[PDB]
Ligand binder design. Structure first.
Ligand SMILES: O=C1Nc2ccc(F)cc2[C@H]1O
Ligand SMILES: [Cl-]
Ligand SMILES: [Mn+2]
Ligand SMILES: [Mn+2]
Ligand SMILES: [Zn+2]
Length: 460
């Protein structure tokens, strides 16, 4: 045997009743699905959103992909990056001819088992040099969501699906999520991405920014094959990866140079990393859990739509993730503390389970901040001044040393205008004596305790 398929991940078939509320359902399956990292969700037979579009008027700029195991690729950036151009129809014609010519078979007579074995053969063989193309970008005027959105008059059926929880345009900005409260520009993370696939086009092993959840819907076409690893095994996987492809682990100059790669799940299984698989067919959802590594490839021409989200469950993990970024010197997409304080400042209109969970995260934030400020005072930093960090562009408030986005506090020095360090890296700013430094802070401890009290009242 040259490829042993991993065991299958969990598959859920909710009733209409269960399927009514997405967040309730995800909370239900969570103890099972978080053991496997990914899971598949089949909607009720009824639930059939209308996909409709003109294949001649949708155009997009294709990305090109070489298919070599352990070779470095860079995560897709929101920028089009292209002079070349396909309509959905001309891409479909390219994609079907490619698959048909590769196997000398009609496109739907190629078994999924065989495409999977062939994918892993061709990525491991050096002389084979297959390149494929694919589409990836957030919605725009030239290529929009596959779900119904408001604007054009809509049919009664379209109106049914316009407000669904499972309409992925809605899911980021619903109530039991926490990304919706963020006022910062985080386009890449709260807007759905649109993916046009062809045979063998693939996505490298990765986890979502800030260890968020994600959910992917296959609108139409041939299936999408997935591999997933549970969150508790993320560091095992990373150690296996570091050993075999250490170049992917050199320091990131920014978030547009994140390096990722294809790697055979059998390799992971040999090093005792648990891995699960699934084929996602048209009309099905795949959900990924916090810090669950995933990868996959398309069986043929298809169209998927995916979005990030964060439940109240995720809040403690969000804080651990930012700490982990600090240890690695990795850039943040947003400030976690800034998001917590924003929610606290809206305590009266918050859902009450949300208020209760924000309260507990804020209590940890405040006790850590108390300890850090005492430490830098003992270093001889005496002068201080309030500062509205949320007004600075992100690139003007990153720690010089660990790149974290400052919000609660930072240290500055008149000696190096415009530069900041977080309170973990006070000794990294410059060589002036500590009495020349200034502590810049968003809130006094006395501002903070009443903010947390408002949450306590709302939670009762
Ligand atoms: O379903 C997919 N996920 C994903 C992720 C990143 C990519 F560049 C491309 C894809 C799609 O094929
Ligand atoms: Cl190859
Ligand atoms: Mn993903
Ligand atoms: Mn350090
Ligand atoms: Zn720092």
């Amino acid at each position: 045997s040259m490829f042993l398929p991993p065991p299958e991940c969990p598959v859920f078939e909710p009733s209409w009743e269960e399927f009514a509320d997405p967040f309730a359902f995800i909370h239900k399956i969570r103890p099972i699905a978080e053991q496997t990292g990914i899971c598949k969700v089949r909607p009720p037979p009824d639930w059939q959103p209308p996909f409709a579009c003109d294949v001649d008027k949708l155009h997009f700029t294709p990305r090109i992909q070489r298919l070599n195991e352990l070779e470095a690729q860079t995560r897709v950036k929101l920028g089009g990056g292209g002079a070349r151009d396909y309509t959905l129809r001309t891409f479909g014609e390219m994609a079907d001819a490619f698959k048909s010519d590769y196997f000398n078979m009609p496109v739907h007579m190629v078994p999924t088992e065989l495409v999977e074995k062939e994918f892993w053969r061709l990525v491991s063989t050096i002389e084979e040099d297959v390149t494929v193309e694919y589409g990836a970008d957030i919605a725009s005027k030239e290529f929009g969501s596959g779900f119904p959105v408001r604007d054009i008059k809509l049919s009664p059926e379209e109106e049914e699906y316009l407000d669904s929880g499972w309409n992925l345009n809605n899911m980021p900005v619903m109530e039991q999520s926490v990304l919706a409260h963020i006022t910062a520009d985080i386009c890449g993370m709260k807007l759905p991405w649109l993916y046009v696939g062809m045979c063998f086009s693939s996505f490298c092993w990765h986890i979502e920014d800030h260890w968020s959840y994600s959910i992917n819907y296959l609108h139409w076409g041939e299936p999408k094959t997935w591999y997933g690893v549970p969150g508790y095994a993320a560091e095992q996987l990373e150690n296996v990866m570091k050993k075999l492809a250490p170049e992917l682990f050199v320091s990131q100059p920014d978030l547009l140079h994140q390096l990722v790669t294809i790697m055979n799940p059998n390799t992971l299984m040999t090093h005792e990393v648990p891995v699960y698989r699934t084929n996602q067919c048209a009309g099905e959802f795949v959900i990924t859990f916090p810090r669950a590594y995933h990868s996959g490839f398309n069986q043929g021409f298809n169209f998927a739509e995916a979005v990030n989200f964060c439940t109240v469950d995720w809040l403690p993990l969000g804080r651990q993730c930012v700490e982990h970024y600090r240890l690695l010197h990795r850039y943040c997409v947003f400030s976690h503390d800034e998001m917590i304080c924003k929610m606290a400042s809206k305590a009266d209109v918050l859902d009450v389970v949300v208020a209760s969970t924000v309260q507990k995260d804020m209590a940890i934030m405040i006790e850590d901040e108390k300890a850090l400020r005492e430490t830098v005072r003992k270093l001889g930093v005496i002068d201080s001044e309030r500062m509205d960090f949320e007004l600075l562009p992100d690139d003007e408030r990153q720690c010089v040393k660990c790149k974290t986005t400052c919000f609660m506090s930072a240290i500055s020095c008149s000696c190096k205008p415009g530069l900041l360090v977080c309170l973990h890296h006070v000794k990294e700013l410059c060589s002036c004596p500590p009495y020349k430094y200034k502590l810049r802070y968003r809130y006094t401890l006395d501002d903070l305790y009443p903010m947390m009290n408002a949450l306590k009242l709302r939670a009762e």
